[PDB]
Design a protein around this ligand. Sequence first.
Ligand SMILES: OC[C@H]1O[C@@](CO)(O[C@H]2O[C@H](CO)[C@@H](O)[C@H](O)[C@H]2O)[C@@H](O)[C@@H]1O
Ligand SMILES: OC[C@H]1O[C@@](CO)(O[C@H]2O[C@H](CO)[C@@H](O)[C@H](O)[C@H]2O)[C@@H](O)[C@@H]1O
Ligand SMILES: OC[C@H]1O[C@@](CO)(O[C@H]2O[C@H](CO)[C@@H](O)[C@H](O)[C@H]2O)[C@@H](O)[C@@H]1O
Ligand SMILES: OC[C@H]1O[C@@](CO)(O[C@H]2O[C@H](CO)[C@@H](O)[C@H](O)[C@H]2O)[C@@H](O)[C@@H]1O
Ligand SMILES: OC[C@H]1O[C@@](CO)(O[C@H]2O[C@H](CO)[C@@H](O)[C@H](O)[C@H]2O)[C@@H](O)[C@@H]1O
Ligand SMILES: OC[C@H]1O[C@@](CO)(O[C@H]2O[C@H](CO)[C@@H](O)[C@H](O)[C@H]2O)[C@@H](O)[C@@H]1O
Ligand SMILES: O=N[O-]
Ligand SMILES: O=N[O-]
Ligand SMILES: O=N[O-]
Ligand SMILES: [Cu+2]
Ligand SMILES: [Cu+2]
Ligand SMILES: [Cu+2]
Ligand SMILES: [Cu+2]
Ligand SMILES: [Cu+2]
Ligand SMILES: [Cu+2]
Lengths: 345, 345, 345
Amino acid sequence: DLKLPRQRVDLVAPPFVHVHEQATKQGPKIMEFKLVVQEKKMVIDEKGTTFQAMTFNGSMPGPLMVVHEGDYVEVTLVNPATNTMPHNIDFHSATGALGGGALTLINPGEQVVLRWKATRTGVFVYHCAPGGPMIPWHVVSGMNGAVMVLPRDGLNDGHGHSLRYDRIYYIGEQDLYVPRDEKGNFKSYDSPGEAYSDTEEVMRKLTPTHVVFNGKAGALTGKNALNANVGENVLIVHSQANRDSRPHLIGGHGDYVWETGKFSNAPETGLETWFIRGGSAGAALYKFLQPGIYAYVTHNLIEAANLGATAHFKVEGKWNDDLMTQVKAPADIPTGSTNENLYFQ
Amino acid sequence: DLKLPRQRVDLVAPPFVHVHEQATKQGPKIMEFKLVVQEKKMVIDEKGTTFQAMTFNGSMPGPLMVVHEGDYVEVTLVNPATNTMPHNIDFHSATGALGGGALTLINPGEQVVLRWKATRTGVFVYHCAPGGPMIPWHVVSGMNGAVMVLPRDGLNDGHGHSLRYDRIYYIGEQDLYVPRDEKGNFKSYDSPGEAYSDTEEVMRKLTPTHVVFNGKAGALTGKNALNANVGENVLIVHSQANRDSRPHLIGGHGDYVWETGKFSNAPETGLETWFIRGGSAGAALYKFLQPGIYAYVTHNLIEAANLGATAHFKVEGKWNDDLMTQVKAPADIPTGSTNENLYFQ
Amino acid sequence: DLKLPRQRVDLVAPPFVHVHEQATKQGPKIMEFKLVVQEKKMVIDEKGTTFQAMTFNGSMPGPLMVVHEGDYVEVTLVNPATNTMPHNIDFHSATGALGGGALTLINPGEQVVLRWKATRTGVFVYHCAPGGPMIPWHVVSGMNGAVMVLPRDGLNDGHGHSLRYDRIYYIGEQDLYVPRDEKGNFKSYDSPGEAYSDTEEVMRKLTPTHVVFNGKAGALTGKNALNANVGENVLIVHSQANRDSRPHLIGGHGDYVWETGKFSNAPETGLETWFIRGGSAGAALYKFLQPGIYAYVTHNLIEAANLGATAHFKVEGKWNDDLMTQVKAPADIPTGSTNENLYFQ
Ligand SMILES: OC[C@H]1O[C@@](CO)(O[C@H]2O[C@H](CO)[C@@H](O)[C@H](O)[C@H]2O)[C@@H](O)[C@@H]1O
Ligand SMILES: OC[C@H]1O[C@@](CO)(O[C@H]2O[C@H](CO)[C@@H](O)[C@H](O)[C@H]2O)[C@@H](O)[C@@H]1O
Ligand SMILES: OC[C@H]1O[C@@](CO)(O[C@H]2O[C@H](CO)[C@@H](O)[C@H](O)[C@H]2O)[C@@H](O)[C@@H]1O
Ligand SMILES: OC[C@H]1O[C@@](CO)(O[C@H]2O[C@H](CO)[C@@H](O)[C@H](O)[C@H]2O)[C@@H](O)[C@@H]1O
Ligand SMILES: OC[C@H]1O[C@@](CO)(O[C@H]2O[C@H](CO)[C@@H](O)[C@H](O)[C@H]2O)[C@@H](O)[C@@H]1O
Ligand SMILES: OC[C@H]1O[C@@](CO)(O[C@H]2O[C@H](CO)[C@@H](O)[C@H](O)[C@H]2O)[C@@H](O)[C@@H]1O
Ligand SMILES: O=N[O-]
Ligand SMILES: O=N[O-]
Ligand SMILES: O=N[O-]
Ligand SMILES: [Cu+2]
Ligand SMILES: [Cu+2]
Ligand SMILES: [Cu+2]
Ligand SMILES: [Cu+2]
Ligand SMILES: [Cu+2]
Ligand SMILES: [Cu+2]
């Protein structure tokens, strides 16, 4: 008796995002999505450490879903019989039944269909939440993604001006809790159930062993750097389902930032570093002004450099010497400025 | 020579709140409160772990005090002779003398009377702060609560519209640092002074053993779930005197959120998760739209599920299938969608 | 071919700030600064613990630089041949080349000259970032400071009213990771290179051993308390290059707070406690209303009291009994209020 047109969406693997309109003249639709749970061993760092991951659609994070305010979102959640555990889904975008968790619990060999109305604009976390201690364990094993609910007129600056992005990337940040043996080496297991007891002990001390973007250390560096061009406005959606993060674009800014992630609120302008509260998604727009490599980090630099939480942008274009220039390349310290140099000595 | 009418307030135990007006036509009053310090052993988790608590009025958190802008707050602080330590009180709502700490130090067998003018609107932490290392130790032993200073016209949305709550709950979140023996079992002591040295060692590593609402794991679940009804606007005041928190209402939202807690600032709209900075109180309004169980957590889900930080709301009313429905209950995965399902495989 | 007037600035050691105008009728200038790297052993706590620090200009934090929107900032970075490591500088205020890091790498015996345009208003972190794991290690060894880019019309309240400070202080907060031996005693080293391996192990567990203002526990207490007078509007700039903080002025407030630190955004009013995201600077204005000692802390009170993170203000002036008074000094609890006292018993 919901009498609206239906539109299948084909999801794509992060950090990319399925095709969508920003501003739309379409009316409300039933937007149809499918998520398939996959339990699998995955490589999470550059030394080849593995862990028993649980995922939506085989990725950490799960894929970004994009709809408009007033759409209905009809999600088929599938739990293949090759899986070992029950799973469900909780949309922070949705109203009632623990975000849908209380209507989507499925055993291996089952699927369920949930519909929720997109009444709240912004970027939102979705995650598995089967009950009790299994809630944090499924989330920190990788069962979390995000959904974006755009206003039908697209983004604005909170002051009556339209904002349009040229490109969008979804950065899902994952805190991982990998057990170690007595010598400090990471431990391997043959199933998620076998890893559980040792993993819960690490989780209880609230200190991750790894903090990664797109599921592994180095996943968005080198060959898999994020592309952009000088002049492009880029939307960077950042989610963290369990733990705080402080995003920073090294050599850039957040031109417009919704750090609490909700487009009914005006964005902040010109941030250096923003804050994604654990259990949320946020978003930053930036118009690139300079070519070159840009690191995108959480600005706990220990987590960024030593636990896995660095992505790169490779930006093509021409250098602007008015914004920044090397006036003098590295040279020998004269003599002759010794007394000057002071001085604190 | 302060020539105003006096009004006694009788405090009640959290999560409930003493009777008060939102909007008032009363002028400034001297609002009279009494807090009695109680040192006592308390049960803090579902396994019956005890710890040597220090409290205002026998509860963690201490009770919520409610006054209006321009009121004077006259607090009698009592330290019974059955107590073993000195105590005092610091109101983050108050101006001068370290929030009142420097005027309220009392030994067992003494009481003191402090008056502060409510010049700043919002929700604010109060806590004990006797000096030096005793400041964190008294606070993380449970000596903290909150005070709400309402505007005389009540709450508003920052855009000229009145906001009224039907119900108010005060959620005090407490980080606890319980010593363990060599086998990992929690240790018991005969007095707070005996527990101190071992507790300070845990405190120094900044990782709590427990994170609890209303003083213990499970304190606001089951029989003591928070009641509401569909259509009610509920104000949820959240305080944390020592450590950050990220509140989330599972299956709901924050319709209007003052996460820094101060009603001179417009609230944010439609949040999924908000952020209570350690040493502050914040507040969220929500109008319930769906019946059923709602979990209220800090969205570090490890802390929520495994260290004690989950409350429940039980909401009566009729389900709205337009907002959310189970389109198809759990069923067998057909065959026939195998190739479809993809695909990431 | 940049055809503007040049103005040398002489930096001063924090928490003080070089002379500058708030509002200015000067046009854009090339503002010339010099920073000299100094590696040196420094005392970081009241027990005389030492560590192998790395600094800009011999201080933690490095000094505050102040310029106006549209100025060009020309920084000579010097790495004396007595140093052992390469260094560079990344301005979060600057656009391109990793904030300048990619144009300023210098070996001992070298200097480099970088120019960046001050296109973004606010307070911003600067820090060393030589590459890879050396980025967090140089930052948490003390190589970080801040730059303030004022609007040419000075500060405003976001609602068309000018804000002017009488005094400015720069509080740089530093998380330190000092290795311990098997007995728990802090370890000493003859060089930063010798300290590195043991320090990286502490860094990896994300729990600092010390959290200090102006480079050491007690650095802004006693003789070095910050001075003010009743009626003065004081700007308190707070930076943290690697880790979150939650500033609080005990017995005061933040009258106007830019916790994300960027003056294109209206400040929040009347905060109790604010939040400096790791990798950022923020700023709070406060007009002192009461004389006496004020503690300024991070409101993790364990970090404030037990790990080093307390500063003091000593404020001269006359006490205002309307704002706060001790109605009755500590006295014997009567008898006769026993039944009253209740009650929770
Ligand atoms: O009381 C609401 C509670 O029930 C759930 C089932 O988990 O949703 C249902 O609500 C009613 C059952 O008592 C029915 O009217 C409805 O058919 C059903 O979806 C939860 O969503 C909610 O928490
Ligand atoms: O971190 C403890 C200790 O363990 C060792 C191996 O015994 O390294 C492990 O931990 C390192 C830090 O996480 C990893 O780099 C490595 O993959 C892992 O085996 C030691 O090298 C280290 O001292
Ligand atoms: O200098 C203010 C300082 O004193 C206190 C006492 O702890 O308040 C007092 O201030 C004056 C004492 O020098 C008196 O005028 C007043 O009677 C008294 O309350 C503190 O509140 C403050 O930090
Ligand atoms: O956590 C360490 C280790 O200690 C034991 C008892 O030896 O359990 C203790 O710690 C648990 C986690 O906090 C608690 O659930 C329990 O109350 C406590 O005794 C072991 O069971 C555990 O492996
Ligand atoms: O592609 C930009 C990249 O180069 C740097 C050098 O580290 O800046 C340079 O940019 C160009 C070199 O390809 C030149 O036009 C320019 O002379 C030079 O400064 C970085 O700043 C940037 O990341
Ligand atoms: O904290 C561990 C343990 O080590 C000792 C010395 O063995 O103290 C060290 O650690 C203390 C806390 O950081 C410091 O106060 C002191 O400078 C340091 O030597 C013990 O006293 C303590 O139990
Ligand atoms: O400038 N960021 O590390
Ligand atoms: O949806 N919260 O765990
Ligand atoms: O009131 N601050 O600890
Ligand atoms: Cu799951
Ligand atoms: Cu959630
Ligand atoms: Cu006390
Ligand atoms: Cu306080
Ligand atoms: Cu360096
Ligand atoms: Cu940086």
